[PDB]
């Protein structure tokens, strides 16, 4: 018959492989769309925050430029973390300490944010790796039941078994149709998440540089009054 | 046909391939379930303890918040390790020293915990590695039995070849059912173990910060 | 007949073949464009490193690198070091200046890498799914053949040999599109690796010059 | 045979010549880089065994005096000494040490990248050889189905040349593929070990320089 | 029959022999050294100094690993006699120890390459055997005039055995390789732990001594 009947006319196991593979494709596209809107907003937002903070030259000016970036802004969180380490460390004479303690804090959040961006990447990678193989299982089960069929009665004349071989190869086809988009989407998510982690790393490096420069200039400036 | 029949209906070799691969699938899923509930527990409780220790403005406050956690808790082991390095170093004028030795200890413990979490990953990795070879051996056995069929019958028909090819495809089907879940489960366990080792590392960072901050505030506070 | 072979396939397998031919076209475009760009930039960098290897100081380096034109990378690194010396004027802690310079220069190199690998993702993905798209071509094709043997009865005389021949041509083109993508990507990884290495060596030369000069200046003004 | 393998096709003959060429490249690489590797490793182990007895850096420069101009250890020792001369007059030793290591380790890294030149070829040949072979076989059985379409004589003597050239394609694919990957893996092991040994000699130089700087700076303080 | 197929199969069987030889000899090595190291670590757990550690390990045996690490730290303390900088000694000692462990690691994994490659390329060399065989068979049916494959079927089965042997040679190589990777992992971990103890004791003693002579 045609494709729809060929689905409805196939075995139960092969039916399950096909329905599963279409489901994996559905998940592939849902993941794609939501993470798309997210990453574009956040990436160009962060691009702005980096362009603005590039003028800071101070870290008082950084907190001032970032004074309103939003309560979910990432640069506002990093700047606030450095500031909080300056406030908790009030009274320390060892700057070499503050800087260390500051860096350890900042570089710890970036990675965490990175790890939250890659949450769900397991599904895309796994679907793109597995889907052709689960499909391959669908067809191999199909033609296996077919060859069990041709030695029962036992038949000949290949045109009698051909529907089974068709309805089996459909499973590999569906496996590949679900598999390919998963692979592409995963690759752009890897590269783009890479660029984002890099950009966030650039803002954090600005914060650390400004803080170090302030501690050095204050300590040296009040050493020779 | 059906499954049980397909077994009792087949050769001795494909009988051993089916029993072997079926066993391998059984161990794969058992590992999955026990280590899954365990990992869920460890992450849940650890995240709780981190939330409690987040209020600590001082290392003493951390030891007090962590006083009643658990005899086997991980955060109590880290705080206890810092305490032990402060005690062994008592009287040292080099704080920059203490800090070093402390970090060195803490960030080793985390790594070690990782290797204990991956204590079971060897089986999944190996099952996923050898399942396609055992399946492929089964199928080659099948197609070989087919050509023996065409050697006896001197026929070339489809129905003398059919049993051997059907057996081969059976070996392949079960081969995939044993091979794939081992690999996905192994990778999902790598991903989850990574996240766990990372979280524990974050608590270690809290301990290290509290220690460094306190040592700096004390050394600077008595001068005057 | 090639035209007849093509006319024997299907509309889906047609998309597979034109798609694979397009993908091969884009891979070769990428190869030529980024190849000429990369050779130009590499030869430029080798020239500049050969020149800067003779600078006994940082003033001598800024002088040898006068131009070098503009968009050059070494002038960008030297300018970053200079910018960090100027922002720190009046700081007595030289340990600081040094630290900060490395943090910038190192990171700058990384950014160059990320700008070199922009667009290589295309090659990686094309080489990744090309055999899978070809394979889809062949399985869809052979599926159409077996449906053909299903609606017409008795046996199949010659009818779909060509359909099957065209599916197999789909896999053939799939591999022919896949292989050059992967080879090109690997040469780009190797060459980018060497490039980051050379740029890293120039950055390291700048760092060495800065450290040596600040140390000798501080020591010469630490006794008259 | 020369007439047998040349019989009936262009593309399949071209994959055949390509894969055999790839095998030639793997084995030529094998012999040339083999003699090079054994020579350089022998020389390095000799030099490390000799330098193990130097109680200072000057004793090291004396053990390495005659090592030769192309020798690696003389290059490392010369790098350390040159960093001592460029830093002449600095009161900060904590610095000198740093600058030396950064130089030395990078030299090693550079030699590492100089060892892996050409290993890319082995890696790629072993990587794509089964796939180029697979294309050979798919082209072959495709030519078989073309053969049964022309004559319409069905089986079995017509499919035979196509199946023959297909299995020849797979056979040549494996014969080019396997030695390439095995040789590449031994080159990973050996390049790892050699990079490590070079690291050990470099580490000896760094240690001697640091220890002598400390004993000099501490030696004119109290006495 | 033929020639190549039998040489390929005997090659695979020799590879299986090497698999089992590595299995037994490396088994003895890893068990012995792992036991010795476990004992030495439990004994050095009593160390409150670096001198007490050099003393507990004095007789551990000359080929002992922990005596080599402890002897390296002590030798760095002796070569540095007269240095006022304790932050120096520490560094050099770490650097020294950090080579030691790595070298020992590299020496334990000297043989795993063979198992890895045998298990990787065994099915493919076997596959070459059968593909050469079936190629010889279809070359056979391409002479004279033929049909009815029942004539060449035994040759083809004989070919498929080459792959069977390839896979059967591959499996023990792969399992053995994974087990030896795990054991080397645990071993590198233990050796690293002993080195870490030596480093701590040295650092702590240099700090307490240096702080005692500041007052």
């Amino acid at each position: 018959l045609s494709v729809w009947g060929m689905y409805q006319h196939a075995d139960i196991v092969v039916k399950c492989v096909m329905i599963g593979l279409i489901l994996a494709s559905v998940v592939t596209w849902a993941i794609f769309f939501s993470k798309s809107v997210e990453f574009f907003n956040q990436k160009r937002r962060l691009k702005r925050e980096q362009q603005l903070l590039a003028e800071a030259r101070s870290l008082n000016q950084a907190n001032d430029i970032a004074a309103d970036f939003g309560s979910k802004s990432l640069s506002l969180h990093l700047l606030n973390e450095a500031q909080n380490e300056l406030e908790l460390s009030e009274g320390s004479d060892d700057n070499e300490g503050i800087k260390e303690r500051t860096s350890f804090r900042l570089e710890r959040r970036v990675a965490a944010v990175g790890r939250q961006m890659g949450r769900g990447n397991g599904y895309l990678a796994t679907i793109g790796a597995i889907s052709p193989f689960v499909g391959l299982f669908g067809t191999v089960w199909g033609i296996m039941n077919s060859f069990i069929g041709i030695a029962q009665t036992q038949t000949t004349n290949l045109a009698v078994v051909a529907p089974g071989i068709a309805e089996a190869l459909l499973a590999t086809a569906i496996g590949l149709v679900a598999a390919i988009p998963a692979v592409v989407i995963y690759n752009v998510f890897a590269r783009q998440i890479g660029g984002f982690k890099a950009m966030l790393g650039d803002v954090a490096a600005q914060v650390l540089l400004l803080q170090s420069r302030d501690l050095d200039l204050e300590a040296s400036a009040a050493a020779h009054p | 046909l059906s499954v049980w029949g397909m077994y009792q209906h087949a050769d001795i070799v494909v009988k051993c391939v089916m029993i072997g691969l079926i066993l391998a699938s059984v161990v794969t899923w058992a590992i999955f379930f026990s280590k899954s509930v365990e990992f869920f527990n460890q992450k849940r409780r650890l995240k709780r303890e981190q939330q409690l220790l987040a209020e600590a403005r001082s290392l003493n406050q951390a030891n007090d918040i962590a006083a009643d956690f658990g005899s086997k808790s991980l955060s109590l082991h880290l705080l206890n390790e810092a305490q032990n390095e402060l005690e062994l170093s008592e009287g040292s004028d080099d704080n920059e020293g203490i800090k070093e030795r402390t970090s060195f200890r803490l960030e080793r413990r985390v790594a070690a915990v990782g290797r204990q979490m991956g204590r079971g990953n060897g089986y999944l990795a190996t099952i996923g590695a050898i399942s396609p070879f055992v399946g492929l051996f089964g199928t080659v056995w099948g197609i070989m039995n087919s050509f023996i069929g065409i050697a006896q019958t001197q026929t070339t028909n489809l129905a003398v070849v059919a049993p051997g090819i059907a057996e081969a495809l059976l070996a392949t089907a079960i081969g995939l059912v044993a091979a794939i879940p081992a690999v996905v489960i192994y990778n999902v366990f790598a991903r989850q173990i990574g996240g766990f080792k990372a979280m524990l590392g974050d608590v270690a960072a809290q301990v290290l910060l509290l220690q460094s901050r306190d040592l700096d505030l004390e050394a600077s506070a008595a001068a005057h | 007949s090639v035209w007849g072979m093509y006319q024997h396939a299907d509309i889906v397998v047609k998309c597979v073949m034109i798609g694979l031919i397009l993908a091969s076209v884009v891979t070769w475009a990428i190869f030529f464009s980024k190849s000429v760009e990369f050779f130009n930039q590499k030869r430029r960098l080798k020239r500049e490193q050969q020149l800067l290897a003779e600078a006994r100081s940082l003033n001598q380096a800024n002088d040898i690198a006068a131009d070098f034109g503009s968009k050059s990378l070494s002038l960008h690194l030297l300018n970053e070091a200079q910018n960090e010396l100027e922002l720190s004027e009046g700081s007595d802690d030289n340990e600081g200046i040094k630290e900060r310079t490395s943090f910038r220069l190192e990171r700058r190199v990384a950014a160059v890498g990320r700008q070199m690998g922009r667009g290589n993702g295309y090659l990686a993905t094309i080489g990744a799914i090309s055999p899978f798209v070809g394979l889809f071509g062949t399985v869809w094709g052979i599926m159409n053949s077996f449906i053909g043997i299903a609606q017409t009865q008795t046996t199949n005389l010659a009818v779909v040999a060509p359909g099957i021949a065209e599916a197999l041509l789909a896999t053939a083109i799939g591999l022919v599109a896949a292989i050059p993508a992967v080879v090109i990507y690997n040469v780009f990884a190797r060459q980018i690796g060497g490039f980051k290495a050379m740029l890293g060596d120039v950055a390291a030369q700048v760092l060495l010059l800065q450290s040596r000069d600040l140390d000798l200046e501080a020591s010469a003004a630490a006794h008259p | 045979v020369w007439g047998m393998y040349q019989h009936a096709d262009i593309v399949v003959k071209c994959v055949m010549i390509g894969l055999i060429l790839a095998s030639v490249v793997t084995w030529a690489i094998f012999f040339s880089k083999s003699v090079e590797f054994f020579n350089q490793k022998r020389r390095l182990k000799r030099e490390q065994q000799l330098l193990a007895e130097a109680r200072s850096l000057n004793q090291a420069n004396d053990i390495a005096a005659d090592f030769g101009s192309k020798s690696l250890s003389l290059h490392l020792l010369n790098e350390a000494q040159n960093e001592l001369e460029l830093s002449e007059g600095s009161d900060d030793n904590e610095g000198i040490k740093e600058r030396t290591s950064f130089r030395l380790e990078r030299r090693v890294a550079a030699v590492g990248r100089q060892m892996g030149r050409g290993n890319g070829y082995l890696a790629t040949i072993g990587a794509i050889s089964p796939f180029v072979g697979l294309f050979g076989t798919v082209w072959g059985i495709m030519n078989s189905f073309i053969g049964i379409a022309q004559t319409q004589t069905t089986n079995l003597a017509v499919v035979a040349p196509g199946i023959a050239e297909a299995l020849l394609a797979t056979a040549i694919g494996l014969v080019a593929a396997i030695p390439a990957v095995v040789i590449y893996n031994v080159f990973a092991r050996q390049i790892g070990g050699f990079k490590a040994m070079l690291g050990d000699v470099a580490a000896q130089v760094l240690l001697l320089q640091s220890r002598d700087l400390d004993l000099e700076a501490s030696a004119a303080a109290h006495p | 029959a033929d020639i190549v197929v039998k040489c390929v199969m005997i090659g695979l069987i020799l590879a299986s022999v090497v698999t089992w030889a590595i299995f037994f000899s490396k088994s003895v090595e890893f068990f012995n050294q792992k036991r010795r190291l476990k004992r030495e670590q439990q004994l050095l757990a009593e160390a409150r100094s670096l001198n007490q550690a050099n003393d507990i390990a004095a007789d551990f045996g000359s080929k002992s690993l922990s005596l080599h690490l402890l002897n390296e730290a002590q030798n760095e303390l002796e070569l540095s006699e007269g240095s006022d900088d304790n932050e120096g000694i520490k560094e050099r000692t770490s650097f020294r120890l950090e080579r030691r462990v790595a070298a020992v690691g590299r020496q334990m994994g000297r043989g795993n390459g063979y198992l890895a490659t045998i298990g990787a390329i065994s099915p493919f060399v076997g596959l070459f055997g059968t593909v050469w065989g079936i190629m010889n068979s279809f070359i056979g049916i391409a002479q004279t005039q033929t049909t009815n494959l029942a004539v060449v079927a035994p040759g083809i089965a004989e070919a498929l055995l080459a792959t069977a042997i390839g896979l059967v040679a591959a499996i023990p190589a792969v399992v053995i390789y994974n087990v030896f990777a795990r054991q080397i992992g645990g071993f590198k971990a233990m050796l690293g732990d002993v080195a870490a103890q030596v480093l701590l004791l040295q650092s702590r003693d240099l700090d307490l001594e240096a702080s005692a002579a500041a007052h």
Binding site: - | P132, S146, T156, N157, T172 | L135 | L134, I141 | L127
Partner: peptide, 23 residues
């Protein structure tokens, strides 16, 4: 990209085994 060898060889035996019969 790896099993594809095994996949295409198994496929080629599913293509060649029907090529075997009859005619």
């Amino acid at each position: 990209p790896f099993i594809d060898v095994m996949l295409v060889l198994l496929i080629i035996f599913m293509v060649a085994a029907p090529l075997a019969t009859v005619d």
